[PDB]
Amino acid sequence: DVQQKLAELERQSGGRLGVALINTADNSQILYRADERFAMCSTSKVMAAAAVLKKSESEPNLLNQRVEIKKSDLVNYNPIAEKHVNGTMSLAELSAAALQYSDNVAMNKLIAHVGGPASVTAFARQLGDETFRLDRTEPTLNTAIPGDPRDTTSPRAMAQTLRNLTLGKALGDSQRAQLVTWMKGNTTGAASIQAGLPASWVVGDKTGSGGYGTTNDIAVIWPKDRAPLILVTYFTQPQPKAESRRDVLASAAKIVTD
Numbered sequence: 141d142v143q144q145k146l147a148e149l150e151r152q153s154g155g156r157l158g159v160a161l162i163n164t165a166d167n168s169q170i171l172y173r174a175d176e177r178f179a180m181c182s183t184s185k186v187m188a189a190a191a192v193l194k195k196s197e198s199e200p201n202l203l204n205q206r207v208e209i210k211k212s213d214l215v216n217y218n219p220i221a222e223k224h225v226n227g228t229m230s231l232a233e234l235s236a237a238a239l240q241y242s243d244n245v246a247m248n249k250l251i252a253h254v255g256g257p258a259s260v261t262a263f264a265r266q267l268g269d270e271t272f273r274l275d276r277t278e279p280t281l282n283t284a285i286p287g288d289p290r291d292t293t294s295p296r297a298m299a300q301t302l303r304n305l306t307l308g309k310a311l312g313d314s315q316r317a318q319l320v321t322w323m324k325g326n327t328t329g330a331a332s333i334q335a336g337l338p339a340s341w342v343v344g345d346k347t348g349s350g351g352y353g354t355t356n357d358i359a360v361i362w363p364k365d366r367a368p369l370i371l372v373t374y375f376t377q378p379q380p381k382a383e384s385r386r387d388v389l390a391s392a393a394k395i396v397t398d
């Protein structure tokens with residue numbers, strides 16, 4: 141029944157929908173095109189920030205290390221970094237900016253610190269994720285051309301990895317809580333997965349959008365007096381200049397939580 145609802149939502153939208161939900165109360169999953177590749181876009185910022193968190197486990201004060209911001213660093217979307225031109229920002233400030241305001245400059249500094257996009261992929265292979273891959277920097281990683289395997293993952297792999305990072309033992313206890321704290325304090329996700337959930341629920345999410353009307357959101361949801369949920373909703377359209385469809389993500393969220 142839930143599978144037929146998710147199918148009808150896709151058919152009526154004319155796009156391609158990717159859903160993976162993990163319920164920790166019974167360890168069950170709800171999957172739709174869960175092994176198909178979808179372009180992550182901005183969502184990829186969770187894996188870049190976590191890579192820096194894992195690095196900081198063995199290097200002392202890393203989130204304190206400062207990084208120079210120049211005007212030539214700036215690209216299409218940098219709401220926080222553009223306030224720091226010819227100043228510095230710590231790796232904590234950049235992590236918080238990438239995750240909570242979706243600053244592409246912050247993400248690029250996080251990518252460059254660990255060694256580049258292939259070095260973020262290497263961090264994903266360390267955790268047991270063999271589908272994730274990062275190839276380019278922001279914003280070119282958002283091109284989301286159908287067929288292109290660059291900067292993609294599957295809904296199943298991301299859901300699994302998100303659980304390991306935010307609830308499981310993939311990072312240290314302090315590092316885990318920090319990511320949770322960052323994702324919970326996001327400002328960008330009110331119209332996406334959150335919109336199809338009850339208002340009172342605590343949510344930590346990372347949104348994303350790009351070419352071909354690609355509309356994305358990955359989330360860990362903590363309902364009061366319940367066990368938490370992990371949800372990945374990835375959507376993409378056939379037309380190159382298609383507008384976003386966040387409402388499809390909210391609708392998919394509702395179908396799978398009630």
Ligand SMILES: O=CN1C[C@H](NOS(=O)(=O)O)CC[C@H]1C(=O)NNC(=O)C1CNC1
Pocket residue numbers: 181182183216217241242244278279280282283328346347348349350351
């Ligand atoms: O996916 C993440 N981002 C960063 C930014 N924030 O996305 S958000 O949707 O999570 O708020 C805006 C959309 C998207 C982005 O950078 N814009 N899209 C592009 O690919 C631009 C580069 N020329 C088109």
